[PDB]
Each structure stands twice: as C-alpha cells, then as structure tokens.
Symmetry: C5
Subunit: 101 residues, 5 copies
C-alpha cells in the first residue's frame, strides 16, 4: 500500500477534518509548539465505531514541562476523521502517515 506523509496543526479555535473522496490514517506522534503556554493539552480523535455511531477518544495528553512529544507509534484510523483539542492555546502538530491501497 502506498504511503504518504501527513501533517496538520491544531489550535484552540481550529480543528482538522481529514476527508477522502481504501484509505487509512495512522498518527506517528503529537508534538507541542514553541508558542504553547504552560498548561495541559489534550488531543481528541473522532471516527467511526463498530455500532455505526461516532465516538470521541483522547489520543494523548501533552505538557510542555513534562512530555512535549507523545508518540502513538501509528494510531491507525479509517477516514473520515476529526482531530481536535479540548484545552491548550496550541499550536499542536499531529504527524501521521496516509496509507492508500
């Protein structure tokens, strides 16, 4: 399956909507930006579950002073996908891989 690089930046007032016209999106790591203030950050991913109902999960919790980067080592998800932050001014960078077969 062909692999491409994928990246996006998420802030307090901005979410990412990964949409496709089989495709898969696995997240390698989530990183904190230089300008992020000293407070907690929590990343959420919304996708499809087995019961045909959209769900929310917390991808990771990052903090500047504790753990600036948290690698999910490829958190595979079927698109469409929604990435959001519930707290933190950001920016936060989600780096993943877009797999198309």
């Amino acid at each position: 399956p062909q692999n491409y690089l994928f990246g996006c930046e998420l802030k307090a007032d901005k979410d990412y909507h990964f949409k496709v016209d089989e495709h898969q999106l696995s997240l390698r790591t989530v990183s904190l930006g230089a300008g992020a203030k000293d407070e907690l950050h929590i990343v959420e991913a919304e996708a499809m579950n087995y019961e045909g109902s959209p769900i929310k999960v917390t991808l990771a919790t990052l903090k500047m002073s504790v753990q600036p980067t948290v690698s999910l080592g490829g958190f595979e998800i079927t698109p469409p996908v929604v990435l959001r932050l519930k707290c933190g001014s950001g920016p936060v960078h989600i780096s993943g891989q877009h797999l198309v077969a």
Copy 2:
C-alpha cells in the same frame, strides 16, 4: 480486517466492560484526563481471570503512556487500581467477518 476507533473513560467508581465473527481490542494510549494505575482483566493461557497493570500515569511525571497496540481478546475489563481519575483509554477495535 475492519479498523474502528475505540475509547473509554475510567474513574475510581467506574469500570469498563468490553463484550461483543472475530473481535480484538488493540489498546494504544492511556492518558490522564483534566498516581493512577490502570488494570486490565482478561483470560490467561490456563483459563482463569488474571489482573495485570496496563500502565501507571502521574500528573507531575508522565500523564500518557503508549502501549503500541496491546492486543487483548474480548471480553475484557478495564479498571483503575488507584486514583480518582479520570483516565482515558483509546485504542482500535478489530472486527473480522
């Protein structure tokens, strides 16, 4: 297989039971919400319930741990050994027809 997103929130007084074709639960992340030990109970080789510590999180030290695809065969029970929480578990539900 079929890849679906799965997530749950665990507290001191709230367990989670995963029950459900072949199904698997691939945990990847356990993150502290806004000393917390997560326990997973499932079947062992010899056929009895077994309690294992999935991860330990702490606000001051490490709020999130990546299991890198900890596979479990359902049914499963996720609980918090200690700490009020909340603690968010996120992973992959694998369904094979």
Copy 3:
C-alpha cells in the same frame, strides 16, 4: 491466539509446555532483568528496563518477544510486568 499475561516482581519463572510478548513494565531505582537462552546456548542477563518513581514509572516494550522458558527478576529496588502469551 493471544492471551493476556502478567506478573509482579522475588523471581518469576515462566514455563509452558509458545511466545511471551512483553508489553509494559510499571511501578506499583528499579531494574527489571530477564534470563533466557542466547544464540550460543548460554543464558544471558539483560536489563529489560530501568524505572524510577519520580522520573518515569512506566516503560513500553512494544512487544518484546521471548521464547519460553524465561525468568524475570528485579536487579535492584513492587513492579508489574504485562504482556501477551502467543500460541
């Protein structure tokens, strides 16, 4: 076939009559030590992980495969080892 496996480290001898896939080591300075066979047919002592309460109490092994029999022990310093039994 995958089964959930765990133990608390005092030694632990895992023997089944198979593969043992270590995933996580958690704290309840500590070092987790593993004994199993090498290529040259001699046992070897290796540090699976080094943990400390105040700097990090958890380590993810990401599926460290070992062929049984194996022995786990605590070199220095309770801790919990969790992983998968594969048949």
Copy 4:
C-alpha cells in the same frame, strides 16, 4: 526487504536532504552533547503532490531528550530541518531497499 542503517545530524544552520523501491523508517530523534526548546520537522510529498512539512518531534534536554518514532516511514525524497533550537540533533533510523 534489505535493512540498512541511516543517520544524520541537524543544526540551526544545517538541514539534511535525502535523495536516492526505497523508504526511510525514522526510528529515534536525540539531543546532542552541545535548554531551549527543539523542534525537528520533516517535509515530503503529500497525497495531492503538494510538499508539506510535518513536525517530526519536540525535544528538550531538561524534560526529555529522546523520542522514538518506531520506524515512522517516509518515502524519499525528504528534507529534515530544525524549526527551532541551536542543535546539534541526531536523527537515526532504517533505510529500506527492495530489489
């Protein structure tokens, strides 16, 4: 397929460029011997063919100097750079070659 070692060094005034089926499985990003925030970024092809830059990792000596991307696969050509931090910063990983 064929598994070779790969490593490179990045600084404020030095980025690295990878040209050559070939693949780059980045494994670890480490801080060198020589307190500010460090950000390591990689840019490569997107699905629409538009070069995009993705923050590989954020490191800091006093908080955590090493990050493992567990083989983060990226198709060459690639460019790795430092958004911030004086460096030096070491990137290591695999080079996959298929005959």
Copy 5:
C-alpha cells in the same frame, strides 16, 4: 524465524562488537545502570560505508531508559558510548533465520 534474547553492557572505555543462517539484531531498550550519556551504533550504510548513528541520549534525572521498539540492524554492528561514564545496558532480540 527464530528469536533469542540478546543484551550487553556498554562501558565508557570499552565498546561492544557484534559479528557472526541470516542474522538480525532487533535492539529494544537502552537503560542506565546503577550524567549525560549517548549511545551510538555503527554499521554499513546504503553506499557501502560505515556510519555513526545515535541510538539514544539518556540522563539519570530526566529519563534513564528509552525503548526503540524493534530497531533492526544487520550485523556486524558496533555499539559504543559516545559520552557519559555509564554503565549502560542494551537489551533486544537476536533474530536467526
């Protein structure tokens, strides 16, 4: 193929050499024994010349262990402590086919 346990102790003064029915070294974890330490692994590259790459950088007061999760290297391989007094423990898998 077959997998065996593998490990070594890297000293500040003494490096470790690995030589050898096709064999791989799947490095898993690098840890501190009982200052700033850096581990280096050298082997062949795609141009047929040895290279130096930093496996990890460890410090007692920040984080004394890091897991690479299957860093595969084709032998022969040389591991060495670029800096730090050590000792440093390397653990991993030796894969034989």
